[PDB]
Design a protein around this ligand. Structure first.
Ligand SMILES: *[C@@H]1O[C@H](CO)[C@@H](O)[C@H](O)[C@H]1NC(C)=O
Ligand SMILES: [Zn+2]
Ligand SMILES: [Zn+2]
Ligand SMILES: [Zn+2]
Length: 335
């Protein structure tokens, strides 16, 4: 049936019988999830007007969706305004408990298109799904730059096979893309502003430490901590392979233009890379741009023998420090 819900509670109660679910100007109650899990296959979900959330310090998610063959869209002029500044305290995962925004867990063979998201209190999309596509999704957390936003990852991917992120537009304060695990991930045409870049990892110490076949391309990173990043955990085991960064342009980079390091311990680099996580088939093709004078252009800190078979074409990162601490990287590459 075609259903239109004006409350989160009504949506949760009636969703199953709806072939079309129009969410009209729903203000999600404090500490509650707009629960759109268990949707019937083929359901179309349309966000209308402005979706808001009442304030409460909690872990989220503000919205959770699951089901197979779900088509999520937003009506013209819609906006999902999380007004995250109410939570932002410059501490992100620390300090006030801030809710994760959208759980796309088990939202299989589904698409989310054109959603306009604003000021997520913490991470935006948590992806743990198969054959999921995010097209023309805009995550505007620009306000977080000056209002204390942190750990406002745009797309966190784990335990997902077949993830397509097409033309996302992101202005946040953490990873534009963060893949802790997954296979067949495609991120293309993205605008990544203010965050931590397009990252694989940190990989290791999870139930799934395999990242395979990730293509990040035609993306532009601006005013971010890093542009191209692959991190693996010290002493951890796992596999990172078939990673392609192609046609990546960067500028306003504060820390690293390109960084692939395997020395993350307790969330911090140590300078001592390990080799339990293999990093194979890394292809950088046309990765160019500038970084800050204080940033390191390229940093490749591989464990012994763990990094193999790379392709390095037209990687030209300028304006920063040229690292003299790189090691164990395939000779085709260079810092
Ligand atoms: C890699 O992922 C892409 C995008 O989903 C897909 O077209 C391709 O078949 C995959 N290749 C392998 C070897 O898994
Ligand atoms: Zn506000
Ligand atoms: Zn199917
Ligand atoms: Zn930061």
């Amino acid at each position: 049936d075609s259903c239109t819900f004006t409350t989160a509670a009504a949506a949760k109660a009636g969703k199953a019988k709806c072939s079309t679910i129009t969410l009209n100007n729903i203000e999600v109650p404090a500490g509650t999830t707009l629960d759109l899990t268990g949707l019937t296959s083929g359901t179309k979900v349309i966000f209308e007007g402005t979706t808001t959330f009442q304030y409460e310090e909690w872990a989220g998610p503000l919205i959770s969706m699951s089901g197979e063959h779900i088509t999520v869209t937003g009506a013209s002029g819609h906006l999902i305004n999380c007004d995250g500044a109410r939570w932002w305290d410059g501490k992100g995962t620390s300090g006030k408990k801030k809710p994760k925004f959208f759980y796309a867990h088990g939202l299989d063979s589904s698409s989310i298109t054109g959603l306009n998201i604003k000021n997520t209190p913490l991470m935006a999309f948590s992806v743990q799904a198969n054959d999921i596509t995010f097209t023309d999704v805009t995550i505007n957390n620009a306000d977080g730059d000056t209002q204390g936003g942190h750990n406002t990852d745009a797309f966190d991917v784990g335990n997902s096979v077949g993830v397509n992120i097409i033309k996302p537009w992101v202005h946040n304060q953490d990873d534009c893309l963060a893949v802790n695990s997954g296979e067949n991930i495609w991120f293309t045409g993205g605008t990544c502003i203010g965050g931590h870049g397009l990252s694989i990892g940190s990989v290791g110490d999870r139930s799934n430490n395999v990242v395979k076949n990730v293509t990040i391309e035609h993306s532009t990173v601006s005013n971010s901590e890093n542009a191209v990043r692959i991190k693996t955990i010290s002493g951890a085991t796992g596999s990172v392979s078939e990673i392609t960064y192609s046609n990546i342009v960067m500028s306003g980079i504060s820390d690293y233009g390109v960084v692939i390091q395997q020395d993350y311990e307790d969330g911090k680099p140590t300078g001592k890379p390990t080799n339990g996580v293999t990093i194979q088939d890394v292809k950088l093709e046309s990765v160019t741009g500038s970084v800050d004078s204080g940033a390191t252009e390229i940093y490749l800190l591989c464990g012994s023998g763990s990094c193999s078979d790379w392709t390095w074409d037209d990687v030209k990162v300028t304006g920063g420090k040229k690292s003299t601490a790189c090691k164990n990287f395939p000779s085709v590459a260079s810092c």
